[PDB]
């Protein structure tokens, strides 16, 4: 009775949205991005290799000063690195050995940490007492942490493993707003440069744009075919690229609500773990699954380079806010800085 | 103003020395332990036996058998979509797989078989190995003796199956329950030797609900796992 007519209304709505997508697709950028000459071969060498972690390194993040970085590994240790002089500033021990996310606050005072313990532990880097002391502890969800980012010092947004995303206040330690629209568990969420929207990608082969004010969805991008693993905004804030385990990386656009350009090769056989861009947004980097990582040109789908320096996975990869370094994480407990 | 940044890097080097000293202190602590994952099915009974012998997302147990310390991690408050959080547990020495070997979801045994299949054929668990437990074989004996819920009507291979030569004797053993229990073993080893080649192996052992030697049995299994990994690195096997 109700279920079949609801399903046929959903099908009619989906057909209408597909027609609306097809109406505004007057052209593709494959015939418009060929005019600018390609960047050619791009080769970069391991400048510094930060050694000292034991287990697999799952996530890293840079700082606002583009000088300090945080690495979280599965041995239960979080290390603040000094990327200029290969130095270790702090080595924070963790309550849970398994972590898959770490964050650096924009004010440089806090480091967030989370993992399979269903707890986002946030530490304090300032003040004159001995060592590093955990300030708050957020536990209000029923699934494993996947990735967490900082809005500012006052709030933090977390992507969870129970098909939910949550916005957490710091002082009260409560969920201000929750984002429940996904059907599979969410891994990667990336914040817009204006700190007002974010897009979260899950294992339902789709990514959803949100707001942090009203707490509802905006777009429902469906253009993939497997579990989306990583996501990262353009520096301009009107496009974003996702990379799934289907060995393809796809770039979407916020304004036309269509997938713009995909990158694929026949020899590419392994999925995507991490995706980050450059300062100009021209050169996007995809941490791959076949024991190395790659460079894409993001206007025309051409492989402009390759970086191969790992004996294992490329679990995470980040690029500084200034753009003078490319950082990579790996399962062979080694961080490398490329320039 | 050279002295200011000079003693700044001096203090930075001192902090580096202290942090590296602490890291080297904890490196032996990390490498001196062995990590085990418990997976499901009677897991509560065997972990209670572990606690007698010795909603958070991860539960903590500690062993101290024979002056070797073991990590055992049992998962909870997590969804059944276990495809992407199990990639963390690849550096563990062994994944303990407890299977309720009496419930034959309409069939629990087939679900156990493809959970084993997905663990075996995954592209990140090839290095790690599995210790298999056929828990709840006491009710298996009563179900075999009843004969109203026979494995024959849910398995066509049981009609033509023959008993292996390696029979384990224990007084008052029904031949039919031994035949069924070793067929249940063989169903798991078909998957185990379908693709397992040198890198990892299965260790199929049978425990009741009142057994107590599971600690020493997991001890021996980790011993053989470390020995086989070392022997494969020596090109000796």
């Amino acid at each position, epitope marked *: 009775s109700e279920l079949d007519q609801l*399903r046929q209304e959903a099908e009619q709505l*989906k057909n209408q949205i*597909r027609d609306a997508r097809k109406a505004c697709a007057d052209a593709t950028l494959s015939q418009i991005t060929n005019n600018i000459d390609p960047v050619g071969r791009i080769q970069m060498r391991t400048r510094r290799t930060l050694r000292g972690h034991l287990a697999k390194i799952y996530a890293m993040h840079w700082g606002t000063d583009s000088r300090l970085l945080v690495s979280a590994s599965q041995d239960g240790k979080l290390i603040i690195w000094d990327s200029y002089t290969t130095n270790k500033v702090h080595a924070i021990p963790l309550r849970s050995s398994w972590v898959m996310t770490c964050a650096y606050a924009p004010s440089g005072n806090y480091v967030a940490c989370g993992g399979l313990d269903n707890i986002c532990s946030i530490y304090n880097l300032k003040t004159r007492e001995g060592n590093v002391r955990v300030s708050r502890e957020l536990a209000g969800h029923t699934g494993y942490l996947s990735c967490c980012r900082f809005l500012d010092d006052n709030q933090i947004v977390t992507s969870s493993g129970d*098909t939910t995303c949550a916005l957490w206040d710091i002082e009260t330690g409560q969920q201000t707003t929750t984002f429940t629209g996904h*059907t*599979g568990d969410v891994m990667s969420l990336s914040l817009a440069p204006d700190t007002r929207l974010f897009v979260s990608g899950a*294992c*339902d*082969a789709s990514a959803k744009l949100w707001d942090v004010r009203e707490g509802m969805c905006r777009q429902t991008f*469906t*253009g*993939h*075919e*497997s*579990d989306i693993n990583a996501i990262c905004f353009f520096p301009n804030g009107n496009a974003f690229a996702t990379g799934s*385990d*289907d*060995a393809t990386c796809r770039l979407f656009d916020l304004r036309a609500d269509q997938e713009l350009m995909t990158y694929s090769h026949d020899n590419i*056989i392994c*999925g995507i773990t991490s995706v980050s861009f450059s300062k100009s947004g021209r050169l996007l980097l995809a941490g791959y699954d076949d024991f190395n990582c790659n460079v894409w040109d993001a206007l025309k789908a051409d492989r402009a380079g390759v970086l191969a320096g790992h004996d294992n996975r490329v679990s995470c990869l980040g690029v500084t806010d200034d753009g003078m370094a490319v950082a990579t994480g790996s399962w062979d407990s080694f961080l490398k800085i490329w320039n | 103003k050279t002295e200011d940044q000079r003693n700044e890097e001096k203090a930075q080097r001192e902090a580096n020395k202290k942090i590296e000293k602490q890291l080297q202190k904890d490196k032996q602590v990390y490498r001196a332990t062995h990590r085990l994952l418990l997976l499901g099915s009677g897991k509560n009974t065997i972990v209670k036996q572990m606690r007698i012998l010795h909603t958070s997302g991860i539960f903590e147990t500690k062993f101290q058998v024979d002056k070797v310390n073991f990590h055992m991690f049992d998962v909870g408050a997590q*969804r*059944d*979509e*276990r*495809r992407k959080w199990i990639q963390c547990f690849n550096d563990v020495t062994a994944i303990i797989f407890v299977v309720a070997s009496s419930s034959y*979801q*309409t*069939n629990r045994l*087939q*679900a156990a078989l*493809k959970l084993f*299949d*997905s*663990i*075996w*054929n*995954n*592209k990140w668990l090839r290095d790690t190995s599995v210790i298999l437990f056929l828990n709840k074989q006491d009710l298996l004996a009563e179900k075999v003796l009843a004969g109203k819920s026979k494995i024959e009507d*849910y*398995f*066509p*291979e049981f009609a033509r199956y023959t008993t292996p030569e390696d029979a384990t004797p224990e007084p008052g053993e029904d031949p039919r329950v031994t035949r069924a229990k070793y067929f249940i073993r063989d169903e798991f080893l078909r998957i185990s030797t379908a*693709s397992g080649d040198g890198r990892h192996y299965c260790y199929p052992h049978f425990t009741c609900a009142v057994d107590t030697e599971n600690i020493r049995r997991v001890f021996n299994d980790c011993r053989d796992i470390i020995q086989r990994m070392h022997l494969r690195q020596y090109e000796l096997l």
Partner: nanobody
Amino acid sequence: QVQLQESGGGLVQPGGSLRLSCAASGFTFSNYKMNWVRQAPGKGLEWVSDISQSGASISYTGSVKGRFTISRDNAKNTLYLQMNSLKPEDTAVYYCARCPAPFTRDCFDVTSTTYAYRGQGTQVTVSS
């Protein structure tokens, strides 16, 4: 978009024949081995049969083999079941489940209570 729309299904007599046909669109078909999962009225999800990427390795459960045969035509983007010697205890809603990863032998969370790459489901009822 990724979707799986399947057809067939109806009230048939025991021991009859019924071609449970399933169709797909979007994703490529040469990779992505696909299984069959059924859920009985009053029971959880259970697996029936699976096929490989090329179509060489076919396996079935205990209550299905020798009676039901599955097949895949990757040119026509169609994979279907074949019901023969149909038992009264096989009534269920059948889902055209799909493995989440390209060309990996392992297949995870096919029988999960919530899933993304799974069909809506067609109901087959068998009775006298």
